[PDB]
Each structure stands twice: as structure tokens, then as C-alpha cells.
């Protein structure tokens, strides 16, 4: 039945790390369009949506829509041991109860094959937000990551404030008060009005692992609405996170 | 009221690590001479004196003598997140209760500002020891650091013995007995008589973080007197530690 | 009166790490032939035999056969602090109760000397039951090490299966099932018949630290018999491990 | 909608201490039968099974089988602060993501309520065993506890030897050799063959905290098979541990 | 010059523990009214005011107002070694630089005398924040102490909420969320309106050692104002703490 | 062939604690007179002499003089686990590398047997001191113990001054200056002239554990000579310590 082979296992390694940060199990919705994972954290505050378009793979075959529930904790453990530069083929057979991962060297002198039992995961229900986003900032993904790590020395909450001149990340706590201001000028603001929301750093931190997938990152906001943080996986996919604003 | 800007935040980062090893809070005596910290460990066995002369800073302004008590634990946490190669401006205002640290990139596209609450710390009450050291050894700071780490596998006490031919560090314990002998030159002994004292490795270890500030380190001894370990910060300051001998 | 000087302390450092993985104390049998260590794990399932031929040392002197029991935990701690590229002289004197390690820089500007108390160790029973190894595989030592680390995500047991055309390492557990197949050449199989044994990963893992001593590693098998894993120390010695199969 | 109220929080306090000794997280299988916990240590050598029958509780309500994963480290911390003689109600609501603990005084003048986040814990494969047991010894639980603490001065392994006349616990090590012999007929041996097995004291020690639940303790053995140590929680449940012998 | 003798040294022992929790040195204002200490923590968030009226002592004499700075750390160390049921006479002389503590047995067969050096302690910064306290709760001092210890398992901040029916202490953190609700009577609420403030547990904890001085404790609150926690020392003095709310 | 059985193991427990405070190994000189231990601290400043007369034991048998070297650290560990109120039989056999300790219940329902390996310990130089003691003070042993613990808050040295009216213990240091004066009777001074010596509290502290053996303790002094501190063990033995003065 299903077969999806990527050339460089890095991609899967880096992806699973990202999504496993948020949830331990997830359904892999596989279509002829490609693989998607959509999942919420157990507190129903944050959502991941990842899509790997079929052009992502050097070989992709998915006639009908199959759905594969997996333990991301186990999957993460197996992927930890796969070499970055080896190929990796995900394969599931008609009514099999197991998915198989197959890695091979460029030189074809080593072949690894792993098998994971599937789960039993109930359909998500709570869906993507339907926004229309007034503001947008795009910045270096690793700067973003650093900023959220940094803001965590102060508090558990970051306030992001977008203005014509740039974006200001702010946090408070016992240690003191911090901010990092990035100037527009590199940081591409493009907003229709000044806007200022707050968020849980716990989740922003989980999101910021996306920096392993994309040199840049885009944040999208809308007053009193879940923000989005998007990491393009070149032209062959995305990783997208949504997070509820804090209280207020 | 105070403004002290260094070009490279590294300096502050490395300093605070050193002094935070010994004490959690300290008063920064700030004069038109520059910043000084003088402080004892809670066991009253060891003393730090640090001075950053005003020529240390690319910009320095301190009309009246203010004293700023700080939590070095918090300060350390904030400095951990400042980029080494960014600038860093320490500033305190007349009516304030807070000191502010302001970092900027070389490119001026990112500005960070942190604020720490001040403390009322009781003014040290313990004077620098009497000088006139009949003995001096100077050595590579990182060798010194390694030696004290090493001597700790044996005991909690190191015996330093200076002779015309060099210096011998010795320790004992369950594991066994060790020594490291460094021969004169590269090791600049310059002494008036052979002399042999013992010291707590706990503190020698704390002092040895000074190796981050200065390629070389000077130890000065005097029979029955606190030794000194000095790290020059170029020509623009020093870091100086004093420690009681072990007698018994 | 024993003296054994190696030019580069690395060797001793890397060796003691390897054997200390298996046992905490061991007798160093010293002859004019060189040093040997032979020891079993406390469960009597696995055996180490190390030999450093006298050509191994830049200086070797052992008139009569002495035996020196040592605490490898202590020895490991002392060797951790000796620089890799320093020389290292092991010396024991006529009924002394202490062995001494002496390190010197290439430049002779630093000299270190450590002393360990000897033990009292009873000579072990098992004594290498050996030979008649029907099958043999040789492979890159670091690949081997990686494979055993990897197989540990699945189980506590690895099944090694040698066939003309390569070796297959397999494991099972909660996470799932995995294998790594290496194809023959690079992997030098040389066997008289297909053969398939199982082993405790705990011990294979301990053995795999041998990769620090030798770019390649040889495994030797024999139906219903302890396997051997051998790491050559470049013509001048070996490190050799033997391990009971799992049978049922 | 789950509810389980015990009259005296002591029970929960003492139980969680016992099981937290072995594992940091565990699933609470809750049925109309009552609560059960079944879990292995991370080395897969030892198994706990606890059952609190529904008659254990002054109020019990569990329509369907729910499973609640918990951090026993956190749960232990919360239970440390609950008064022994207060009541304690464990409550979970439909898709709540949190369990709540509610304590009340006998006099209803003080009410405490705590909330713990649940975990997704993967269901444990290893299923007790089906088993006979040829031998049986029952003894004062606190004597047993003391004996295992004692045997730990000698070694990491205890040898239990059952004979018609009593049971002999034995251990060895650097310190020397010890034994404690308890005579039958107070010690209820009841066996169909003499036998002698060995076990890890680390785990026997963990098990022996059961003495807080039950004045007596029963050990059951079977040649070459996991022993069992059982603590009856009066008539309203049990705590049961299984441990692999040391073999060879 | 000063003489103040208490019959039972317990009092001093218990007091110094309490105040030493907050500050390491303090000025003892000594008048013919009695001894008073008024002192702030280094963060200027918390104030202690202690008064021991002259009727507190079996013998009291202080013609002029002297001020004695003392090291409470040293004083604490000396008081640790004074027997609870011995008498204790504090004495300072005209020309002295030292205060002396003199202990004697009931039977006059043992006499101890200790001498502490005085300090020049600068800050008289202070300022009791007297105000209209709208709300008042009085409760068993040891329950209060337990509650703050308990709330610390969750967070570093407690929210106290006074209502007609009682007072609710609440905290949050990694471990979870907790509360303790005490119902009105035994717990004597007496308030003019419902009121809800937050406070640092670090300081509430320091204050709660007051339970050694007084079976009951009174807390007084006022919207946007420092709370007060008061421990009466019989009829012969008080210990009173004031603490800034957490606002943000 | 030696056998020495005491009725209550307490005695051995309390003794070994006392002497293990000073040294880690010691020879047990066993004669028909009884058991004696004599040992010096490794700094050759302090000496223990213990004697248990043969009437001490409910059963004692020692035809010839045997000497048993023991590790007091191990012995202490074994004795920690022996019940106070059990009997304890020490037994050594003709040409046996091991001594055996055998404990039994009053009720004979439990028997424990431990075996320690002996050591070859070289006879020390260690001559008991010569003199006839000019001064003598006898006091409650636990008061003495408390006094030395107390004097340690000040210094590492205590000055004991005997006069017609009583004895004065004095110490100095960073914390301050202390004394305890005990008045003559209850404290039995009996001296031929006033005399004032100083001693290391480290050792006085070690000695003061003798209070577990004897309600009273006697100190004996002689100008410029080792003091003695003696603890009678009923009428059936003594424990005696000697310590060099500090000369200044």
C-alpha cells in the first residue's frame, strides 16, 4: 500500500523532534497530496500542523487515504539512531498493524529496518483556526529561538509587540525584566495596525525547534486570536503552530 | 547618574562568573576611578577584590560615588544570555532602585535591555590583607586551573611549595597521592626564600576561573599570611583573591 | 623492580576506561614478555584479556614475574587527569605496597607523579576456554559500537547472524523490532558455515569502548560457545573480550 | 467521571512512597473493581502490582475503565503535605487532563484541593506471570525490612535459603560476610522442598517499605523463577512485588 | 550602661531565629521602654519590627538610649548553645565595643559568659507603613506555618483571599495547583469587605517561624498595601512583619 | 582459641563508636586479663587506651595472648546493625584469618553471625604517658560533652583552667569569646595547685563520646604534659584518652 522515501533522513529526524515536543502520539494522514500530522497539546492550547507535500519525497505512493497513528516517543527513539545522510523509507502494507522504516547508505553497504506497532488514535476534532491575520513578522529562525530561550530567564510569559519600526519581545519575573527589540530596517514587518499580544513561553519554546527546518520563521497575529508560527520546509512542505493568547 | 559601556560583553560575562563563584551578592562601588567589588565568602576565609579602571570602558561617567548592591546569581543569568560580541551598557539613574543593562549588536539591528533590582547590602567590613610578599610565582592561568582541578581527585587540600627550581603542587587522600611540579623558566619564580603553604582546593578552584580573563596568573605568598592570586585584566583592571592558609 | 614507560599516555587512558567498564579491580601480571590483565565480570559471564607486549613500551624492565593488584576506579581517576600526549611511566619497587605513575611533558617543563596503593586480589578461576572459531567477521570498530548502542533502544539482547554476504544484528522490545545488516566486501566475513547466536547488549556495549583503541574490530563465533571480540593494539598487544551466548 | 475517597489519607501516603521507590510514573487502571497499578522498573527486572479493591473506599464510582498516568514524584510531593488523618478524594472528570485530590478534616473546618496534570504513559507489556509457588515464608514485615537494610552493609546481593527449620538471609562483600537466621514456628515456613535463591538487595530494599502497610509480609519462591513479596492491605487490597533471581 | 536579664533564655533563642531569617545584622534600639529592632530585608520588600517591653525582663536598666549593632548570625550561633531554661543577661558597658551575654543555671552551679563585638550598622531607612487595616484573620500559628510550607511545593507565590466564610491560600507551579481553605469560627475572620492579595512565600516562610513565640498569629490586610503578620509575645512585646504585595 | 560474650551488645556498639572516632584500625590485645585496645591518632597527638576486664563478659576464655587487628570502620558498620539488647559473642579460632561476631536474641528465635577479616597492624611506638597527675576534676560526662561542642562555636582550641573554686573552659574566634565556668561541690575538683592548659577541641570532641559509657568523666592534668580523660565502664573496664597540650 503506502511508500514514502526521503533521500536524507535528517528531515524526518528534525521533524519528529519538533512535533514530539508538543504531543506523544499523532496520526499521520497520508493522501496522494502527501503526509500531514495535525495534533493538539493535551491542554488544548496549542496546535501543530505539518505537511510534507508529495514532491518532498524521491518516491511517494499513496492511492487511497490511509491514517497511521504512531507513538512519537518511540519514533523519536528510532530516528535518533538513523544517520542524517542515509535515506529513509516509510512503508505500510494493506492491513498490517505495523509501519516499517528502512534506511540505507548512499553506498548500499548497510541497510537498517525498524518496525513500529501502530495505535488506535481517535480523530482530532478541534480544528485549525480560520483567521485572516492583520500583522506579520518574519525573522531569522535561530534569532527567534534564542529570544524565547532568553525571555525564559525572566518569566513564563512573553509579550510580543509589533509596531511599524519593529517587534519587541518582553518578559518579567524574579530575576528582573527583559526585552529584545528587533528593528525593521533582517526583520520584515508588514502589518495593518500596531498590535500587542502575550503568550506562554513553554509553547513558544517548543515551537522554536522549527529553526532546525528553515533559516527564517514567520509569526502572524490577529487581535484576541491564536497566533501562528510557520516554518517553511523549502517548497516541499510546512510546519505550522498555533497558540492561544494569554488570558486578558 | 552612572553609565559604563564596554565594547565586548564577554568581559562582564567572564567576570561575573568568577566572582559569583565566591559570593551571591556584592556591592559595586562606582566612582570616577571606575567600578570595584570587594567581598568575602560567607565562611570569612577568602576575599575577592576586583577593579575595573575607567579606561576599561569605551564610555564612563560617574560624577558622585554610588554603591549598587546586586544579586550576582540574577546578574549571572542575565549575562548568560548576552552575546559575547555585543556591547553592554550598565546605567543607573538618580531616582531609580534598578540598574539597567543594555546590549546592542555591532550592526544596531537588535537592542536588548534588562533591569535588575538593587539590594541594600551591608558595606563589606573586612579589609584587604597586608602586603610585602616574600615570594612570587607566575604561570599560565589555564595550567594553574587544570592543576587545581587535578589535585581535587586526591584531597580537599593542596600544598604549594616554592623553591628556586620551581613550584610543586601536592595533595593526598583515599585515591592516593599526587603532585605536579612546574620548572622555572613558562614559570617565573622570583622569591626571597623557600616557602611552603597549604590551601583549601574548594577556593583555589573558585579562583581558577580567572583563567578566562588573563593568559597568566600570579600567586604571592608570605609565611603565616593570606596568599594572593591575581589576574590582570589587560592594563585596565585586576581580579585579586586572598585566601587564608590551612594551619595544623 | 618494574618499569614500563609508554610515550603517549593516551594508550593507558583508553585501556583503563575499557577494562574498568567490566571490573573495578584487576591484577596486572607483569613478565619480561610484558603486561597482561585477565579478569571476569562479577556475574562470571564475561572475561577480559589484555596484553601489552614489551615492544609496546619505549622502556620496559621486568626481571621476575610480579603481580600488581589495582583499583581500576582509582586508576581511572588518576589517568583522567594525565594529558594524552605526555609520557607515562609505571614503576613498582621491591616489596613497596605502592605503584607509581610518572608523567612528563615532551618539553620536560612539567612532571607529575601519582602513587596508588596495591591490593590483595585473588587470582580468577575461568582462564579462557577458547578456540575453534568457525566464523569471523571484521568491521569498522566505531560502526560496531554504534550498532550496539542502537540495538539497545529495542532490547537487552542482540542476535547476530552471519551468512555468506554479511552479518545481521537484530533486537526486540517495547519500542519495536530493529535490525542493521552489513554487507560483505568494509565488512570481512570469513566463515565455514552460517551461524546465529544471541548476546547481552549490556556487555557488548562495555566491549564496544574498544573502538577507542583500534579502527577495526573482530568478532569470532562458534556454535554453543563464548564469542570473542578482539581489538588489536597495532601489533604490540591486544584487548580481547569473551562472552557467553544466551541459550533457550 | 471517577471518584475514589479513602477515609484516612495515610493509606495513599504510604502506598505512593512504596511504589515511587521503584518507578517515577505509573498508570492507575481504574475499574468498578477498584484501582490497580502495574509497573516495571526501568531495568525490567522487577514488577509492582498494587490493587485497591473498591470496598477500600468510603466512596467509589467508576462506570467505565479509565486509565490515569501520573508522575509519582509529583504525587509523592503533594501527599507529603496531606495530613494522615484527613480524608482524601481522588477525582477525574471526562477529558479533564487533570486529576484532583481533595482533603478534608474530620471536623470539616479545613479543605485542601490539589490538581495534578496527567501523563500519557504507554501501556506496560510485561504481564506478571502465571505461577505456582513451591515455598512460602511469612514473617514480621519490619524484621524483613531491617534484615535487608542490614544485609546491604555487606553486599548488593542477598541469598535466601529456606529449610524446614527456618530461613537464612546471607550476604558478602569487602566488609565481610553476614547472615541472619530466623527460626520456624514468628516465622511461618510452609514449603514443599528446600531451596536457595539469590536477589538484588537494591530491589528487596525498595520492596521492604511495604512494612508501612502490613505488620506481616509473605515471600513466595519457585526454582529459577521470579520471587514474589506480598503485603496485604488488610482485606481491601494488596501490594505485590516480583523480582528476578540472580542466576549462575 | 545596659542590663537586660530574661529568666528563660528560650525567648531570645526563639526570637533571634525568627529575625535572623530576614536579616544578618540589626540595630538594637535600647531605651528605658525596652529593646526594639526594626529592620528591612535587602530587597526593601519586608520589614521586621520587634519590641520587648521592659516588663519582659526580670531585671532591666537602660538610663540613656543606646543603639547596639549586632551580627545576628553570630548571636544565633551563641544562642544555639545556651540552655533554654537558663537565665540570660545582656549587658553593655560605657566604654565597651562589646556586648556580653551571661547565662546561669537555676541552681547557680554553672555560669557561661559570651562576648560579641558590636557593628556600626548604617541603615535607619525603615518607616513602619501604618494604615487602616480593613481585614483581619487570626489563626493557629502552627497551621499558618504548615500552610506556607505546603504552598511552597507548588510555587514561590501565595494568593490569600479573605471572604465572609474564611480565608483561602492558593499557589501554582510545575507540580500543579493547590489550595487550603480555612473556614470561619479556630479561624477568626473580621473584615469590612472581601479582599484578595498575593505574596512571596519566601518571606511568608521566614515570618512563619513566629509560631515558636505565640500559639496564634494575626494577619492584617488592606487593598494595595503591605500586609502585617503579628505574633504577640505574651503581654510583654510583639514581633511584627510587614510585606509588600506582589502587583502586576 | 578466644571467646568473649557480652550480654548487651550496646557496650560494643558504644565503644567502637568512641574509638573509631580517633583511628580506623586497631589491635585488640586479648589476654586472660581481658581485651585492651591501644592506639594513636595518625598525627601522633592523641592516644586511646581501652580495657575491658574479663569480669565484663558473661563468658570469657583466652588461654594465650592473641592479637587481632581490625578495621574499625567495618566493625562500626556491622555493629550499627546489631540490636543493643541482643548478646554478642566475639570468637577467633586457632589459625583463622577471621574473627566472628554472633548475636542472639534474649528469646533465642533469631541468630546473626558476622565475620570480619583480620589485618596485620604494626605495633605503634605509642608509650602511655608517665606522670603522676597534680590536678583532677570530675564532672558529669554529658556536661563535659556539651561544653566541648559549645566551645567549638568560637575556636579550635579550649583553655581549661583549674582553681580551688572550679574549672573554667574558654575559647576564642571570629564569632567571639566564650567561657563556661563550673563551680566546685556536681564538680569534684581535687588539685594541689592552680593550673591552666590548652587543647585541641577536635580531639576533646572525639573523646567526649565517652559520655555514652559513663555518667561521669575524669580529667587529669600536669604542667606541660598530656592530659588524660577517663571514662569508667562500671567496675569492669575503662576508656582513657591522652592528649598533648597546645604550647604557644
DSSP three-state, residue D80 = helix
Buried b (16+ CB within 10 A) or exposed e, A16-37: bbbbbbbbbbbbbbbeeebbbb
- DSSP assignments along C31-53, one per residue: ETTEEEEEEE-TTSSEEEEEEEE
| Contact (Cβ atoms closer than 8 angstroms) between residue B9 and residue B79 | yes
Q: Which residue of D has its CA nearest to A42?
A: D97
| Cα Dmax for chain E | 60
Q: Which of B65, B69, B59 is nearest to B3 (CA)?
A: B59
Question: Whole-angstrom Cα distance, residue E92 to residue E115?
Answer: 10
C177/A111 CB distance under 8 A:
no
Chains E and C touch (3+ CB pairs under 8 A): no
Q: Chains A, C: CB contacts under 8 A, how many?
A: 46
Residue of D nearest to A70 (CA): D122
The three cell numbers locating residue C185: 566486501
Of F29, F51, F20, the closest CA to residue F209 belongs to F20
Q: Do F111 and D175 touch (CB under 8 A)?
A: no
Question: Which residues have CB under 8 Å from D64's CB, separation 6+?
Answer: none
Rounded CA-CA distance A50/D9 in Å is 46
Q: Which residues of F touch D175 (CB under 8 A)?
A: 74, 77-78, 116
Looking at beta carbons, which residues of chain F come within 8 Å of D152? none
* DSSP letters for B7-62: S-THHHHHHHHHHHTT-SEEEEEE-SSEEEEEEE-TTSSEEEEEEEEGGGSSEEEE
For residues E46 and E22, the answer to whether their CB atoms sit within 8 Å is yes
Angle between helices B72-80 and B10-20 in degrees, nearest 10: 140
Residue that the C-alpha cell 597521592 belongs to:
B177
With 0-12 / 13-18 / 19 or more C-beta atoms within 10 angstroms meaning exposed / middle / buried, residue C22 is: buried
Residue C20 C-alpha, separation from nearest chain B C-alpha, in angstroms: 15
Contacts of F167 (CB under 8 A, 6+ apart): F137, F139, F160, F161, F181, F182, F187, F189
Q: Rounded to an integer, what is the distance from CA C80 to the centroid of its chain?
A: 18
Say how far apart CA E166 and CA E157 lie, in whole Å. Answer: 20
**In 10 A of CB C51, how many CB atoms?**
18
CA distance A43 to chain D (A): 7
Whether the CB-CB separation of F50 and F19 falls below 8 Å is answered with: yes
Q: Cβ–Cβ of D180/F114 closer than 8 Å?
A: no
Query: How far apart are the CA of D102 and the nearest CA of chain F, in angstroms?
Result: 41
Map residue A112 onto helix, strand or coil: strand
Q: How much of chain A is in helix, strand and coil states, percent to nearest 5?
A: 20, 45, 35
How far is it, in rounded angstroms, from Cα E51 to Cα E19?
A: 12
Report the phi/psi class of residue F215: left, alpha or beta, with left for phi > 0 and alpha for psi in -120 to 50: alpha
Q: Which of A25, A42, A117 to mutate to test the interface with D (most CBs of D within 10 A)?
A: A42
Which residue in the set B97, B119, B125 is minimally distant from E42, CB to CB?
A: B119
* Burial class for B231, CB neighbours closer than 10 Å (0-12, 13-18, 19+): buried
CA distance linking residue B74 with residue B119, whole number of Å: 12
Contacts of A128 (CB under 8 A, 6+ apart): A38, A47, A49, A242
C102 and C42 Cβ atoms separated by less than 8 Å: no
Is C180 close to A77, i.e. CB distance below 8 A? no
Looking at beta carbons, which residues of chain D come within 8 Å of E179?
A: 112-114
Q: How far apart are CA F91 and CA F37, in angstroms?
A: 16
| Cβ <8 Å between D117 and E176 | yes
Let me know: does C61 contact C1? Beta carbons within 8 Å.
yes
Cβ atoms of D72 and D23 within 8 Å: the answer is yes
- Element containing residue D202 per DSSP (H, E): helix D201-207
Give the H or E element holding residue D77. Answer: helix D72-80
Between the alpha carbon of residue A192 and those of residues A133, A183, C98, D103, F169, the distances in Å are 9, 17, 80, 53, 83
Torsion, Cα A183 A185 A191 A196, to 10 degrees, reads 10
Distance (Å) from the alpha carbon of F97 to chain D's nearest alpha carbon: 12
Residues from chain D contacting residue A42 (CB–CB below 8 Å)? 97, 117-118, 120
Reading the block at residue E8, the C-alpha cell is 528563660
Neighbours of chain F (3+ CB pairs under 8 A): D, E
From E56's Cα to the closest Cα of chain F, the distance in A is 25
How far apart (Å, rounded) are the C-alpha atoms in residues F18 and F7? 20
Residues of E at the D interface, defined by Cβ within 8 angstroms:
149-150, 153, 175-183, 186-187
* Residues linked to residue F135 through DSSP beta bridges, in sequence order: F221
SS (H, E, C) chain E: CEEEEECCCHHHHHHHHHHHCCCCEEEEEECCCEEEEEEECCCCCEEEEEEEEHHHCCEEEECCCEEEEEEHHHHHHHHHCCCCCCEEEEEECCCCCEEEEEEECCCCCEEEEEEEECECCCCCCCCCCCCCCCEEEEEEHHHHHHHHHHHCCCCCEEEEEEECCEEEEEEECCCCEEEEEEEECCEEECCCCCEEEEEEHHHHHHHHHHHHCCCEEEEEECCCCCEEEEEECCCCEEEEEEECCCCC
Q: Which residues of B93-127 are buried (b: 16+ CB within 10 A; e: fewer)?
A: eeebeebbbbbbeeeebbbbbbbbbbbbbbeeeee
Which one of E150, E152, E173, E175 makes the best mutation probe of the D interface by having the most chain D beta carbons within 10 Å?
E175
- Closest to F105 (Cα-Cα) out of D143, B153, B28, D54: D143
Contacts of A187 in chain B (CB under 8 A): 109
**What are the strands of the beta sheet with A25-30, ordered from one edge?**
A66-71, A25-30, A34-40, A46-53, A237-243, A227-232, A216-221, A135-140, A188-189
| Contact (CB<8Å) A73/D122 | yes
10 Å CB burial of residue C85 (0-12, 13-18, 19+) is exposed
Q: How far is CA B91 from the centre of its chain?
A: 22
Are E144 and E128 in contact by the 8 Å Cβ rule? The answer is no
CA–CA separation, E98 and A138 (whole Å): 68
Q: How many CB atoms lie within 10 A of CB F31?
A: 14
Residue of F139, F144, F176 to mutate, testing the E interface (most E Cβ within 10 Å of its Cβ): F176
Partner-chain residue, chosen from D97, D117, D120, that has the shortest CB–CB distance to A24? D120
D101 chain-E contacts, CB cut-off 8 A: none
State the method.
X-ray
How far is residue B200 from each of residues B44, C74, D54, measured CA to CA in Å?
Answer: 13, 22, 61
Residue of A235, A219, A190, A233 whose CA lies nearest to A10: A233
Query: What residues in B contact C74, CB-CB < 8 Å?
Result: 175-176
- Give chain E's contact residues with F (Cβ, < 8 Å): 74, 77-78, 80-81, 98, 108-117
Strand E2-6's sheet: what is its strand order?
E59-62, E2-6, E87-92, E98-104, E110-117, F177-183, F166-172, F157-163, F195-200
**CB of F183 closer than 8 Å to CB of E110:** yes
Closest CA to B207 of B42, B27, B47: B47
Nearest chain A alpha carbon to B82: A150
Q: Do chains F and A touch (3 or more CB pairs under 8 A)?
A: no
Q: Which helix (H) or strand (E) holds C159?
A: strand C157-163
Whole-number Å distance between alpha carbons of F44 and C3: 35
* Grid cell in block for residue B35: 567600578
Number of structural domains chain E divides into: 1
Distance, C-alpha F13 to centroid of its chain: 12
Exposure string for F71-87, b = 16+ CB within 10 A, e = fewer: bbebbbbbbebbbeebb
Residue B95: which residues within 8 A CB-CB, separation 6 or more? Answer: none
C-alpha cell at F178: 566564650
Calpha distance C229→F211 (Å, rounded): 61
Angle at D77 between CA D71 and CA D81, to 5 degrees: 140
- What dihedral angle (degrees, nearest 10) is formed by the CA atoms of E232, E234, E236, E239? -20
- Tell me the three state secondary structure of residue D44: coil
**Taking a C-beta distance cutoff of 8 angstroms, is the pair F92, F28 a contact?**
no
**Nearest alpha-carbon partner for A246 in A216, A231, A230, A225:** A225
Is F181 in contact with E115 (Cβ distance < 8 A)?
A: no
Chains B and D touch each other (3 or more Cβ pairs < 8 A): no
DSSP A12: H
Range of the domain at B137: 1-248
The whole-angstrom separation of Cα C95 and Cα C66 is: 10
Smallest Cβ–Cβ distance between E176 and the set D109, D110, D114 belongs to D114
Contacts 24+ apart (CB under 8 A), B77-80: B77/A153, B77/A175, B78/A153, B78/A175, B78/A176, B78/A178, B78/B114, B78/B116, B79/B9, B79/B12, B79/B13, B79/B16, B80/A153, B80/B13
- Are residues F76 and F82 in contact, defined by beta-carbon separation less than 8 angstroms? no
Distance from CA of B44 to the nearest CA of A (A): 27
Distance from CA of F6 to the nearest CA of D (A): 19
Helices F72-80 and F10-20, packing angle to 10 deg: 140
F113 with D178: Cβ contact below 8 A? yes
Q: Are B65 and A133 in contact (CB under 8 A)?
A: no
DSSP A152: T
User: Residue C71 in 3-state DSSP?
Assistant: strand
Place of cell 556536661: F143
Strand order across the C157-163 sheet: A59-61, A2-6, A87-92, A98-104, A110-117, C177-183, C166-172, C157-163, C195-200
Residue C237 pairs in a beta bridge with C52
Q: How far, in Å, are C32, C108, E153 from residue C9 at the CA level?
A: 21, 15, 50
- Residues from chain B that touch C112, judged by Cβ atoms under 8 A, are 178-181
Task: Give the span between the Cα atoms of F186 and F3, in whole angstroms.
Answer: 40
Upper half-sphere CA count for residue F52 (Cβ side, 13 Å): 18
User: Residue B248: which residues within 8 A CB-CB, separation 6 or more?
Assistant: none
**Do chains F and E touch, with touching meaning 3 or more CB–CB pairs less than 8 Å apart?**
yes
Cα(E150)–Cα(E208) distance, rounded to whole angstroms? Answer: 12
Helix (H, G, I), strand (E, B) or coil at D212: helix
**Contacts from B191-195 at CB under 8 Å and sequence distance 24+?**
B191/B134, B191/B135, B191/B136, B191/B137, B191/B162, B191/B164, B192/B134, B192/B135, B193/B134, B193/B135, B194/B161, B194/B162, B194/B163, B194/B164, B195/B134, B195/B135, B195/B161, B195/B162, B195/B221, B195/B222, B195/B223
CB nearest to B109's CB, from A175, A179, A182: A182
CATH number at residue F35: 3.70.10.10
The grid coordinates of residue E26 equal 540589626
Helices (H), chain B: 10-20, 72-80, 141-151, 201-207
Give the residue on A whose Cα is nearest the Cα of C165: A109
Classify each residue of A216-232 as buried b or exposed e, where b means 16 or more C-beta atoms within 10 Å of its C-beta: bbbbbbbeebbbbbbbb
Helices (H), chain F: 10-20, 72-80, 141-151, 201-207
Amino acid at each position: 500500500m503506502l511508500e514514502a522515501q526521503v533521500q536524507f533522513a535528517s528531515l524526518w529526524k528534525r521533524l519528529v523532534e519538533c512535533i514530539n515536543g508538543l504531543v506523544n502520539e499523532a496520526n499521520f494522514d497520508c493522501n496522494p497530496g502527501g503526509l500531514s500530522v495535525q495534533a493538539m497539546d493535551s491542554s488544548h492550547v496549542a496546535l501543530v500542523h505539518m505537511l510534507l507535500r508529495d514532491d518532498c519525497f524521491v518516491k511517494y505512493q499513496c492511492g487511497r487515504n490511509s491514517i497511521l497513528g504512531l507513538n512519537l516517543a518511540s519514533l523519536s527513539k528510532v530516528l535518533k539512531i538513523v544517520d542524517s545522510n542515509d535515506s529513509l523509507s516509510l512503508r505500510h502494507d494493506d492491513d498490517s498493524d505495523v509501519v516499517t522504516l528502512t534506511s540505507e547508505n548512499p553506498e548500499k553497504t548497510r541497510k537498517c529496518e525498524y518496525q513500529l506497532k501502530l495505535l488506535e488514535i481517535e480523530a482530532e476534532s478541534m480544528g485549525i483556526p480560520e483567521m485572516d491575520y492583520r500583522s506579520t513578522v518574519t525573522l531569522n529562525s535561530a534569532e527567534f529561538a534564542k529570544i524565547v530561550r532568553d525571555m525564559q530567564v525572566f518569566g513564563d510569559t512573553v509579550t510580543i509587540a509589533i509596531s511599524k519600526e519593529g517587534v519587541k519581545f518582553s518578559s518579567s519575573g524574579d530575576v528582573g525584566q527583559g526585552y529584545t527589540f528587533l528593528q525593521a530596517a533582517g526583520v520584515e514587518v508588514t502589518m495593518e495596525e500596531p498590535i500587542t499580544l502575550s503568550f506562554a513561553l513553554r509553547f513558544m519554546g517548543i515551537f522554536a525547534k522549527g529553526s532546525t527546518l528553515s533559516e527564517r520563521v514567520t509569526l502572524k497575529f490577529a487581535k484576541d486570536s491564536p497566533c501562528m508560527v510557520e516554518y517553511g520546509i523549502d517548497n516541499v512542505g510546512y510546519l505550522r503552530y498555533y497558540l492561544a493568547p494569554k488570558v486578558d
